Design a protein around this ligand. Structure first.
Ligand code: BCL
Ligand code: BCL
Ligand code: BCL
Ligand code: BCL
Ligand code: BCL
Ligand code: BCL
Ligand code: BCL
Ligand code: HEC
Ligand code: HEC
Ligand code: HEC
Ligand code: HEC
Ligand code: CA
Lengths: 50, 308, 32, 38, 39, 39, 50, 39, 38
C-alpha cells in the first residue's frame, strides 16, 4: 500500500494512485509545452490582438 | 450557537447569499460599462426607417449634367406621368426617391447628355420599366392603401418599398424566413379573400387544409414581427374585433392584385414588368408592422399618391 | 426590460428546485 | 463523513467557471476591444 | 475518509478539458478571424 | 486498490475516437473546401 | 485521525482535508495574482473608463 | 480475471462493421458522384 | 459454451430478412427499373 508514496502524502495517495498521478502530471506538462508552441505559431500566422 | 457547526452554517449561508448578489452586481456593472447603447432609428424626413444617404453611387458628372439641365430647362420637356412639376422638383424626386430607392446612378436609366432622350442608347428598356413601375405605384396606393383609416398613419408606397436599395436580384421569399416551413411554400394567391383560408367548423375540410392555413398564418406573423394576437383574439379565431384583421384583408387583396396584374398578366409571365417574382408580405414589411421604405405623408409626387 | 430584476426573479425560479435535489441527495447518501 | 466542505468547494468551482464564461462572452460580443475581429 | 477520490477528479478534469477544447475551437472557427477551411 | 479498470479506459478511448472521426469527416464534407465527392 | 490540524477546526477537518484545503488556498492566491496582472495589462491596452 | 470477453468483442465488431458498411453505401449513393442507380 | 448456435441462427435469419427488405425498397424507390408502373 503506502510504500512508494512519500511520507507527506501518505493519507491521500495509494500505491497505484501515485503511479497514475505521475503519468497524469507528465501528460499535462507535455500538453502545456505543445500548447505554447501552437499558440506561438498561430500568433506568427495571424495575430488575434490589434 | 455554542458549537462550531452552527456558527459555520450561519457564516456559510450569509457568505453564499452575499456572493450571489455581488456576482450579479459586478456582472451587470461590467455589462453596462462596456456595452454600447443601441442606435436610435432614422430621422429621415421622407422614409419611415430608411435612408438614401450616403449618395456615393451618384458621380460628379451626373450632378453637373443635372445642374446644367435644370439651368437650361425650367420646365420638363417630355413627361408622360409626372405632371405639374418643374425640372427642379422632378430632379429632386429623381435624386431622393428614384435612384435613391434603387441606389443606382442617373446613367442606369437616362442618357446624361440629354435627359429628355427616349431611345438611341442601350438603357432605354430600364426607363420604360421605370415609367411602368411609377404607374403601378400610383394605382397601388390610389385604390388599395386609400381604403385604410387615418389611424394607421397615411404612409405611401414608393420605390424604396419593394426595393430597399437594390435594383435587381430582389428576394420575396429569402431562406432566412423559411425556418419552420418547407422551402418551397408560397402564398396561395389563387384564392379569394375573405374566405380563402377559413377552416373553422367546416365538414368539407380536414387537417391538410388546416396545415395549409397555418403556413400562411406563420408567414404573416413573421412578416409583422409579432405574435398571433396582433390580428386575433385567440379564444375565437373567426372574430373580427381587432382592426388589423381588416387591414390584412385589404392587404391580401392588394397582393393578389399585384400577382394577377403585374407579375403574370393574363396568365403568362412574359407580359409582366417583374421577372416572374411573386410578392409576399415580407417583401415590403421587413419584420415591422410599417414598411421601413414607406414614405411619410406628403412626400410622394401628388400624381403618384392616394390623394388623386 | 430591467434585466437586473429579471435575473433575480430567474434565480428565485431556479432556487425553487432545491428541496427536490436535496431529497435525491439525501436518498443517495443514506442508502449506501 | 461531513458533507459541508466538499459541497462548498464544488459550488465555488461551479460558480467561478460559470462567471468566467459569462464575462468572457459578454466582453467578446460587445466590440469594445479588438480581440477576434475579421 | 478522503475528501475527494482520485478517480472522480481525473474524470471531471478530462471531461472539462475536452468540452473546453471543443468550445474554443468552435468559437474561433465561427468568428472568422482566421482563414481555415475556406472555399 | 486500482482507481481505474483497463477495460473501461479501452472502451472510452474507442468510443471517443470513433465519434471524433465521424464528426471531423462530416464537418470537412459539409465545408466544401475539398473536391472529394462532387456530382 | 486528527493530527496536524489545529484544535479550533478539528470538529470540521481531518488531515487529508487539511492538505486539500491548503492546496485550495494556494491555488486561490496564485489565481488572484494572475488576475490582477491580466487586468493591468488589459487596462494598458484599452481603458474602459474615460 | 479476464479483462475482455471474446464474445462481446465479436458482437461489437460485427455490429460496427455492418453499420459502417450501410453508412458508406448510403453516403456514396446519395452523393451523386457515381452513375449507379439512375433514372 | 461461450457461443450458442441458436442465437447465431436467429441473428443471421433476422439480419438476412431485414437486409433483403431494405434492398428491395431502395431499388424500387430508385426508379431505375421498369417494375410495377401504372
Ligand atoms: C489512452 C490510450 C491507452 C493507452 C495508450 C498508451 C500508449 C501509446 C503508451 C502507453 C504507455 C503506458 N501505459 Mg497506457 N494506455 C491506456 C491506458 C493505461 C492505464 C489505465 C488503467 O487505463 C494504465 C495504468 C496505463 C499504463 C501505461 C504504462 C504501463 C505505460 C507507461 C506510462 C508512461 O510512461 O507515461 C509517462 C510519460 C508520458 C505521459 C509522456 C507524455 C506524453 C506527451 C503528451 C508527449 C509530448 C512530448 C513533449 C513534447 C515532451 C515533454 C516531455 C514530458 C515531460 C514527458 N495505460 C489507454 C487505454 N499507453 C506507454 C508505453 O507502454 O511505453 C512503451 C506508451 O507509449
Ligand atoms: C479582452 C479580454 C481578453 C482576456 C482578458 C482576461 C482578464 C481580465 C482575465 C482573463 C482571465 C482568463 N482568461 Mg482571458 N482574455 C482574453 C481571451 C481569452 C481566451 C481566448 C481563446 O480568446 C481564453 C481561453 C482566455 C482564458 C482565460 C483564462 C486563462 C482565465 C479564466 C480563468 C478561469 O476560468 O477561472 C475560473 C475557473 C474555475 C474556478 C475552475 C477551474 C479549476 C479547475 C480547472 C477545475 C478542475 C480541477 C479539479 C482538480 C477537478 C476536480 C474538481 C474537484 C476537486 C473534484 N482568455 C482576451 C484577449 N482574461 C482571468 C484570470 O483569472 O486570469 C488567470 C481574468 O481575470
Ligand atoms: C491561438 C488562437 C486563439 C486561441 C485558440 C485556442 C484553441 C483552439 C485552444 C486553445 C486552448 C487554450 N488557450 Mg487559446 N487561443 C487564443 C488566445 C488565448 C489567450 C489570450 C489572452 O489571448 C489565453 C489566456 C488562451 C488560453 C488558452 C488555454 C485556456 C488553453 C490552453 C490550455 C492548455 O494548455 O491545454 C493543453 C491541453 C492539455 C493539457 C490536454 C492534453 C491534450 C493531449 C496531450 C492531446 C490529445 C489529442 C488527441 C485527442 C489524442 C490523440 C489520439 C490518439 C488515439 C492518442 N488562449 C487565440 C484567440 N486556444 C486549448 C484548450 O482549450 O484546451 C484545454 C484549445 O484547444
Ligand atoms: C486534412 C484535412 C483536414 C483534417 C481532416 C481529418 C479527418 C477526416 C480526420 C482527421 C483526424 C485527425 N486530425 Mg486532421 N484534418 C485537418 C487538420 C488538422 C489539424 C490542424 C492544426 O490543422 C490538426 C491538429 C489535426 C489533427 C488530427 C488528429 C486529431 C487526427 C489524427 C490523429 C488520430 O487521432 O487518429 C489516428 C488513429 C488512431 C491512433 C487509432 C487507430 C485506428 C485504427 C487504424 C482503426 C481504424 C478502423 C479501420 C478503418 C477498420 C478496419 C479494420 C479491419 C476490418 C481489421 N487535423 C484538416 C482540416 N483530420 C482523424 C481523427 O479524428 O481520428 C480520431 C480523422 O478521421
Ligand atoms: C478588462 C475587461 C473587463 C473585465 C473582463 C474580465 C474577464 C474576461 C474576466 C474577468 C474576471 C474578473 N474580473 Mg474583470 N473585467 C473588467 C473590469 C473589472 C472590475 C472593475 C471595477 O473595473 C472588477 C472589480 C473586475 C473583477 C473581476 C473579478 C470578478 C474577476 C477576477 C478575479 C479572478 O478571476 O481570480 C480568482 C482566482 C481563481 C478563481 C483561481 C482559479 C484560477 C486557476 C488558476 C484556474 C484557471 C483555469 C485554467 C485555465 C485551467 C488550466 C488547467 C491546466 C491545463 C491543467 N473586473 C473590465 C470591464 N474580467 C474573470 C472572472 O470572472 O473569473 C472568475 C474573467 O474571466
Ligand atoms: C470506391 C468508392 C468510394 C468508397 C466506397 C465504399 C463502400 C461502398 C464501402 C467502402 C468500405 C471501405 N472503404 Mg471505401 N470508398 C471510397 C474511398 C475510401 C477512402 C479514401 C481516402 O478515399 C478510404 C480510406 C476508404 C476506406 C474504406 C474502408 C474503411 C472500408 C473497407 C475496409 C473494410 O473494413 O472492409 C473489409 C470487410 C471486412 C473485413 C468484413 C467482410 C464481411 C463479409 C465477408 C462480407 C459480408 C457478407 C456477405 C455480404 C453476405 C454473405 C452472408 C451469407 C454467407 C449469405 N474508402 C470511395 C469514396 N468504401 C466498406 C466498409 O465500410 O465496410 C465495413 C464499404 O462497404
Ligand atoms: C440486380 C439489381 C440490384 C441488386 C438487387 C438486389 C436485391 C433485391 C437483393 C439483392 C441481394 C444481394 N445482392 Mg444485389 N443488387 C445489385 C447489385 C449488387 C452488387 C454490385 C456491386 O453491384 C453486389 C455486391 C450485390 C450483392 C448482393 C448480396 C449482398 C445479395 C446476394 C447474396 C446473398 O446473400 O443472397 C442470397 C440469399 C440467401 C443466401 C438467403 C436465402 C434464404 C432462402 C433460401 C430464401 C428465403 C425466401 C423464401 C421465400 C422463404 C422460404 C420459406 C418457404 C415457405 C419454404 N448486389 C443491383 C444494384 N440485390 C439480396 C439480399 O440482400 O439477400 C440477403 C436481395 O434480396
Ligand atoms: C431609372 C430607374 C431612372 C433613374 C436611375 C433616373 N431616372 Fe430620371 N427619369 C426616369 C423616367 C422613367 C423619367 C420619365 C418620367 C415620365 O413621367 O415620363 C425620368 C425623367 C427625368 C427627368 C425629366 C426630363 C424631361 O422630362 O425632360 C429628369 C430631369 C430626370 N429624370 C432626372 C434624373 C436624375 C438627376 C437622375 C439621377 C439622380 C435620374 N433622373 C435617374 C427614370 C430614371
Ligand atoms: C413592389 C410592388 C415594387 C415597387 C413599389 C417598385 N418596384 Fe421596381 N420592381 C419590383 C420587382 C419585384 C422587380 C424585379 C426585380 C428583379 O429581380 O427582377 C422590379 C424591377 C424594377 C426595374 C428593373 C430592374 C432591372 O431591370 O434591373 C426597374 C427599373 C424598377 N423596378 C423601377 C422602379 C421604380 C422607379 C419604382 C418607384 C416608382 C419602383 N420600381 C417601385 C417591385 C417593385
Ligand atoms: C395579421 C397579419 C394576422 C396574423 C398575425 C394572424 N392572422 Fe389568422 N387570419 C388573418 C386574416 C386576415 C384571416 C382571414 C383569412 C381569410 O381568408 O378570410 C385569418 C384567419 C385565420 C383563421 C381561420 C378563421 C376562420 O374563420 O376560420 C385561423 C384559424 C387563424 N387565422 C389562425 C391564426 C394563427 C394560429 C395565427 C398565429 C400563427 C394567426 N392566425 C395570425 C390575419 C392574421
Ligand atoms: C408593399 C406593396 C406591401 C405589401 C406587399 C404588403 N404591405 Fe402591408 N402595408 C404596406 C404599407 C405602405 C402600409 C401602411 C399604409 C397605411 O396607411 O398605414 C401597410 C400596412 C399594413 C398593416 C397595418 C399595420 C398597422 O400597424 O396597422 C397590416 C396589418 C398589413 N399591412 C398587412 C399586410 C399583409 C398581411 C400583407 C401580405 C398579404 C402585406 N401587408 C403586404 C405595404 C405593403
Ligand atoms: Ca425550412
Amino acid at each position: 500500500q503506502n510504500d512508494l508514496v512519500p511520507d507527506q502524502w501518505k493519507p491521500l495517495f495509494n500505491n497505484a494512485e501515485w503511479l497514475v498521478h505521475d503519468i497524469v502530471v507528465k501528460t499535462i506538462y507535455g500538453g502545456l509545452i505543445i500548447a505554447v508552441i501552437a499558440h506561438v505559431l498561430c500568433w506568427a500566422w495571424t495575430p488575434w490582438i490589434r | 450557537t455554542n458549537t462550531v457547526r452552527g456558527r459555520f452554517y450561519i457564516v456559510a449561508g450569509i457568505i453564499s447569499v452575499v456572493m450571489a448578489v455581488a456576482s450579479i452586481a459586478i456582472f451587470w456593472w461590467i455589462f453596462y460599462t462596456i456595452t454600447p447603447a443601441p442606435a436610435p432609428p432614422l430621422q429621415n424626413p421622407i422614409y419611415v426607417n430608411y435612408t438614401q444617404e450616403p449618395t456615393d453611387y451618384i458621380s460628379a458628372e451626373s450632378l453637373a449634367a443635372m445642374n446644367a439641365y435644370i439651368q437650361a430647362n425650367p420646365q420638363p420637356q417630355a413627361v408622360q406621368v409626372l405632371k405639374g412639376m418643374t425640372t427642379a422638383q422632378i430632379s429632386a424626386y429623381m435624386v431622393a426617391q428614384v435612384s435613391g430607392g434603387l441606389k443606382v446612378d442617373c446613367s442606369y436609366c437616362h442618357n446624361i447628355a440629354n435627359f429628355a432622350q427616349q431611345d438611341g442608347y442601350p438603357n432605354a428598356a430600364k426607363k420604360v420599366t421605370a415609367r411602368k413601375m411609377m404607374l403601378m405605384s400610383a394605382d397601388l396606393n390610389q385604390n388599395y392603401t386609400a381604403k385604410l383609416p387615418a389611424s394607421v398613419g397615411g404612409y405611401q408606397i414608393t420605390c424604396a418599398t419593394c426595393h430597399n436599395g437594390k435594383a435587381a436580384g430582389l428576394e420575396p421569399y429569402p431562406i432566412e424566413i423559411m425556418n419552420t416551413l418547407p422551402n418551397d411554400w408560397r402564398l396561395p394567391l389563387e384564392l379569394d379573400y375573405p374566405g380563402g383560408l377559413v377552416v373553422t367548423g367546416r365538414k368539407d375540410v380536414s387537417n391538410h387544409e388546416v396545415e395549409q392555413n397555418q403556413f400562411a398564418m406563420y408567414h404573416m406573423n413573421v412578416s409583422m414581427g409579432q405574435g398571433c394576437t396582433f390580428c386575433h383574439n385567440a379564444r375565437y379565431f373567426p372574430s373580427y374585433e381587432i382592426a388589423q384583421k381588416n387591414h390584412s384583408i385589404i392587404m391580401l387583396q392588394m397582393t393578389k392584385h399585384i400577382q394577377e396584374t403585374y407579375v403574370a398578366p393574363g396568365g403568362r409571365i412574359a407580359d409582366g414588368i417583374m421577372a416572374g417574382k411573386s410578392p409576399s408580405c415580407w417583401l415590403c414589411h421587413q419584420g415591422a408592422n410599417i414598411p421601413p421604405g414607406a414614405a411619410k405623408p406628403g412626400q410622394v409626387p401628388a400624381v403618384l399618391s392616394s390623394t388623386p | 426590460m430591467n434585466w437586473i430584476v429579471a435575473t433575480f426573479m430567474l434565480m428565485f425560479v431556479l432556487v425553487a428546485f432545491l428541496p427536490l435535489v436535496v431529497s435525491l441527495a439525501y436518498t443517495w447518501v443514506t442508502n449506501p | 463523513r461531513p458533507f459541508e466542505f466538499r459541497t462548498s468547494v464544488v459550488v465555488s468551482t461551479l460558480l467561478g467557471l460559470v462567471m468566467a464564461l459569462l464575462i468572457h462572452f459578454v466582453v467578446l460580443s460587445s466590440g469594445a476591444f479588438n480581440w477576434l475581429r475579421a
